[PDB]
Amino acid sequence: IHVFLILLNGVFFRLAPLFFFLPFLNNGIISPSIRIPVIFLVASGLITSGKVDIGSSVFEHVYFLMFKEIIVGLLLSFCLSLPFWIFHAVGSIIDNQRGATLSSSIDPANGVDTSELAKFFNLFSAVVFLYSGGMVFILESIQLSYNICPLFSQCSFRISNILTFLTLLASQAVILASPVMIVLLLSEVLLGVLSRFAPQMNAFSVSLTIKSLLAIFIIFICSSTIYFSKVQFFLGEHKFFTNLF
Amino acid sequence: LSFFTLLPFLVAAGTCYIKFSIVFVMVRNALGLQQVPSNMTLNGIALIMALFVMKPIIEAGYENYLNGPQKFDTISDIVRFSDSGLMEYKQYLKKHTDLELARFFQRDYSLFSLLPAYALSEIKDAFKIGFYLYLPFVVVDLVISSILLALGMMMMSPITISVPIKLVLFVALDGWGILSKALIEQYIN
Amino acid sequence: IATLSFFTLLPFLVAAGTCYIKFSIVFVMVRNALGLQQVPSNMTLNGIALIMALFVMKPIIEAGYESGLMEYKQYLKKHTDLELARFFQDYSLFSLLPAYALSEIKDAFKIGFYLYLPFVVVDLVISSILLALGMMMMSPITISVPIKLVLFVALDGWGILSKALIEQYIN
Amino acid sequence: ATLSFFTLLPFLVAAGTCYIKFSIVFVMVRNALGLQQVPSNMTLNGIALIMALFVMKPIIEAGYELMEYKQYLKKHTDLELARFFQRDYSLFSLLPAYALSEIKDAFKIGFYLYLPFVVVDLVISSILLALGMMMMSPITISVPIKLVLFVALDGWGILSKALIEQYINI
Amino acid sequence: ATLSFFTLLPFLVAAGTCYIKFSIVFVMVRNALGLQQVPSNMTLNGIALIMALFVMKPIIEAGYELMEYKQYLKKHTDLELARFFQRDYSLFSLLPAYALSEIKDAFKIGFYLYLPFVVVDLVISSILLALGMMMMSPITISVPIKLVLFVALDGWGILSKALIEQYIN
Amino acid sequence: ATLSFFTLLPFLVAAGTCYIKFSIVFVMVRNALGLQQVPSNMTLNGIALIMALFVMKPIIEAGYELMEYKQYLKKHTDLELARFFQRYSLFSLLPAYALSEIKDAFKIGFYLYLPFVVVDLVISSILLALGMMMMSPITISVPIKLVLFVALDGWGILSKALIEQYIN
Amino acid sequence: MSDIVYMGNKALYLILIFSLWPVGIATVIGLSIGLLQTVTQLQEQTLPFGIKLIGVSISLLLLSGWYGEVLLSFCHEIMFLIKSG
Amino acid sequence: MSDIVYMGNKALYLILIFSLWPVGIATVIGLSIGLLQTVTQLQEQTLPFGIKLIGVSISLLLLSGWYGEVLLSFCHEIMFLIKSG
Amino acid sequence: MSDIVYMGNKALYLILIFSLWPVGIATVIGLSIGLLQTVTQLQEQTLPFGIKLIGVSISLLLLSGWYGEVLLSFCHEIMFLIKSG
Amino acid sequence: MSDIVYMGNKALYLILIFSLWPVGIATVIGLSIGLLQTVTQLQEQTLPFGIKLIGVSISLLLLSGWYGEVLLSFCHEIMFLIKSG
């Protein structure tokens, strides 16, 4: 047992960035005495189920495949955690719409950074993902990453598709927010009309009062657009991450 | 100094520790309390509770460890001890691991190919339960935020004010007692 | 491996089985009560709580240092809930640790809610008198900390708090 | 001496590589929209991290298999500022000069794009005051108009496509 | 067991030395001046540790030769609160009383110097509401005035001279 | 004794080196511009650490074989403040140096924190004179507070004027 | 995953049914005394927090018992969902 | 848990008592100087803050002794309850 | 705790004194230009910041020494209270 | 701190100097059409803002060179003082 562990760190530093920013294995929700043994169990389960490929490899390659796997395993983490980062987006552009974290939208020092509705959506979508083939899909996505550039390959990955990532994450977030956001703006423009026809009121306070509750009411009568983006995302991460490399 | 150090965590990975040591950590993050039920405290409470759950597994496996004879210190004999020397923790693993995730660590199961499947199954299940616990602490959190923005005051954060209400909701619930009872009755019937 | 496998688990047995729980959930909640997020410096409060827990555990430590402890066992059946120690079941040691730990977490949250509360009253008062005055945009965390400290030094503060919190264990 | 290896590696990637240029421009676009959370800080510090590691990929692959990295420093450092620290070159007298050159260029290129957002903010505020009403906050109206006009202008795609082409041939 | 020697030594420093008195006061000065990030919190832990180790220096090298540190503890411990943790003196009966007395004293000396900054914050808030506007947060405008009121005081020099003369005659 | 040193290596860096002088200033420049998130505080720790270790280079590369370190402390300590801790030994040069550079870094930061709030109040003044009140001038004031900083050669002349006190 | 949808819509219903009463009283009082800052000219954007604060007090202190019991009878239902499978 | 209920209702009572006086004086001065912003033209929202600021000093520097004592007589009783089990 | 009570009372006194001048000058200049909202057509809720902005500056640019000196000599008094007991 | 007296009082000087013109042109042209809000029937606060946005801008487009040579020279003075202690 000397060659057993040189294959073990190469799977560690591919899968340890998969737990960092995957918001049901790290929002500070598992202890740092759990991350290291959970990865040393999952990695030991992967390299005895035969889900690797020989590179016939030593004499310059201890820290050399370190920086390799971080450029690969992060790319596995990023297209795998796209929906949660939409819902953690779609919480924010709902509660910064109604003014929850509008305290820190002026002086970002002593107010709200990680708010109270975005954490609710970020756990709720993690649960809805996690029932519907949660850890199976992630772990076969790890073997799909192993199908392309296992741990000894060159990983000369295609460029211009990880640069459209963040506009994908913005486009889906604004489109998915669109039933909530435009009615809040219709309400606030209508109350601006009311402030024009009565130029003495506090339009800001009266705007906040109705415009928080109306947002939480519109999130309630949705019932439809919560789960069915993840079949799209199943086919998506089978397609995108295949054509990223 | 890793196998000298992380072996009390590798062994305590995939017994029952994960199942508690997320949920308590997910109850602390649910109350708005960012640090105060200290991490080195809650990872101790979860450890002693999980070792209580594992004690009738541990001594009755140590009986099979002790009578033996079980010549050791090689690869094949420890694999033989993992099935024909334990025989009841493996049934404990088969009880709580998914019939669709333990098949992933394969090519009538063994032992070493269920511990990652068991660890991820408990991360899955503990995250389910921790979301159900998080779920009535955001009704109070969003009610306080809504009636606090509705009462003019926007700049003051509800993280300061909600914690008395998120604890008068929680100690009157009986709190860690009814939670730990309802969470340990899954493992001790 | 025994000289590190017994040392790695030992902070968990101090912060899980001793009286440390009862202080480490209170004092770090005193800090978050005042609005101060960092300044009493968690490295420090986990030292105050640890030496004050070692002061309580000291007649247990030197007695058991000489079925081995048996005064720690009798210590556990004094702050454990009676209707919760019957759920984790003569008695033992390790069937008595988790009932004690859960009992002190529940009692420490009750103590913490008692003292988190005479500060949120003055926090909401400063916010109300600072909105009705008009100055809506300024955060009252700047103004509220002097009043939440003059309200706490006039209490005599940490002295009478640790007195009233250690009288349950030493009397 | 591998304790100083992993510890000083965030203090070398965020200080000596191209992570400065992206970690400032991205978080400067986010703060311009008013919405300072919806791309997360953990999100932007992952996009900028892989966008910096892909630029550092041929440099590390050529160097560890340091003269290639010094060519990368000398190409992008201001010569008017690198000569001050040398009072050819050495390595360690360029990383402060390179880091300050990238911070100055980051604020320069970030300010060149921060400007069409404040003019649409002033457009929204001016058309709100021109329609009588004044006593309403136009930040909350302007923020989704600063989103849906930024997403439909292809946004981060047209941004970061020419923010790494300054450092690579794509 | 040199690890249990060493894993408690930060608890002996932050609990039994004079590190409490500076690690509360300095770290509260950062919170006092509005900007709660600026002197790089680990920096203030550095300054407070080197100053507390300076104060403990005639106990540190005079311990490597023990009835010279408890006599330090008896000087700054409360008279009546050390008697509560008693029932001469002993060891493991003063460090709680010493630590609680210096936390109380640190909050007192902290509230003394916290106070001439909330007055200038409320002054700036009042002149900024009286100047028509409401929406601009005065945390921005407060910080340069809260620093011109601090640097012109001689600042950290006169503060640490006022704060360390209690422990050195 | 090999883990008794790395537990105090960052304390000697952030308390005894030139790091203080930069890590107060640049973090204050981030807070000065009104954009108090974007230069990514670990980045500023990186810039300040490499720029401080550049000054420490003739001290470390002559100290690996200390006397020039004590000379470095005696050069950058106030006359009117080293006398107090003196009432030679290493532990009495450290706190006077650390407090001297905290006071000097707050002075240097105050000199530069000041030409930004004047343009902040200019933008607030022209915003209220132009009718509008409910819109905060933070978002509108950021680009002007930064174009005032780019046209000052950015961070170049700032770091030159901040490091020339240490390289004669 | 029916339990998640039912608990999530029940939480978003409890937020609405709790926050409908005091936020509704707050916006009725704010809009109404804004209408008294119309034709009887009393143009001050400093008034209504003096009156909204009492309504949100009275409509909470009258109703804080109910805020307990359903939200406690809610919190036990969830407990059954973790005494189940 | 009835002690928790009594302490919580006493806290809501102390918030409402301590914010009846100065918020009430502030809104009474605001409404009463809005009465001078009636037919006697004073249509500027500046003079209320010039006078409300002194009121919530005068109703707060005269009265803060009482704000001490009851709020300290509260803070001892809580300490009494944690002198118990 | 008479030192603490004296420092707190002097703090409220310094708030009231240091804000009595510029708020008073601001509202006097505002009401003085509001006397031109008589029969002369000057109904604008935008004009007085055109003058009030100079007034708050003039009673502070000409008065920054006083705002210095006592508020600096106050900061020495506190220092005395922490140099002594 | 004697140079801080000179640098600090020059900060309030530039608040007076650099904001005299753009507020002043705003309170002249905004008062010029405010003088067209006299007996001339143009009672709007809608068209006397689009003339004020363009009224400030001509005093902000042409006069912006006065903001350049001396506010940088004010910052070149500051950069010269910090080369000393």
Author numbering:
A (entry chain F): 10 to 254
B (entry chain A): 11 to 117, 132 to 213
C (entry chain B): 8 to 73, 94 to 116, 132 to 213
D (entry chain E): 9 to 73, 96 to 117, 132 to 214
E (entry chain C): 9 to 73, 96 to 117, 132 to 213
F (entry chain D): 9 to 73, 96 to 117, 133 to 213
G (entry chain G), H (entry chain H), I (entry chain I), J (entry chain J): 1 to 85
Study text:
Export of proteins through type III secretion systems (T3SS) is critical for motility and virulence of many major bacterial pathogens. Proteins are exported through a genetically defined export gate complex consisting of three proteins. Here we present a re-refinement of the original FliPQR data to higher resolution (3.65 Å) and also the structure of the equivalent SctRST complex from a virulence T3SS (3.5 Å), revealing the high level of structural conservation within this core complex between flagellar and virulence T3SS.
Many of the systems proved fragile, with little to no SctS (FliQ) associated with the purified complexes, but the Shigella flexneri export gate (Spa24, Spa9, and Spa29—here referred to as SctRST) could be purified at sufficient levels to allow structure determination by single-particle cryo-EM. Here we present the structure of an equivalent complex from the Shigella virulence system at 3.5 Å by cryo-electron microscopy. As previously proposed based on the sequence conservation in all three components (33% identity to the S. Typhimurium FliPQR across the operon), the structure conclusively demonstrates the structural conservation at the core of type III secretion systems. As suggested by the nMS analysis, the biggest difference between the flagellar and injectisome export gates was observed in the Q/S subunits. The highest-resolution SctRST map was generated from ∼200,000 particles and displayed density for 4 copies of SctS, but with evidence that the 4th copy, corresponding to the lowest position in the helical assembly, was substoichiometrically occupied. Further three-dimensional (3D) classification of this particle set produced a series of lower-resolution maps highlighting the compositional heterogeneity within the SctRST sample, with evidence for SctR5S2T1, SctR5S3T1, and SctR5S4T1 complexes. Furthermore, the order in which the SctS copies were occupied clearly progressed down the helical assembly. This observation is in agreement with the nMS data and supports the hypothesis that the complex is assembled sequentially, with the SctS component being the last to be added. The greater fragility of the virulence complex versus the flagellar complex means that our sample contains a variety of differently assembled complexes that differ in the number of SctS (FliQ) subunits associated with the complex, supporting a model for sequential assembly of the complex coupled with extrusion from the inner membrane.
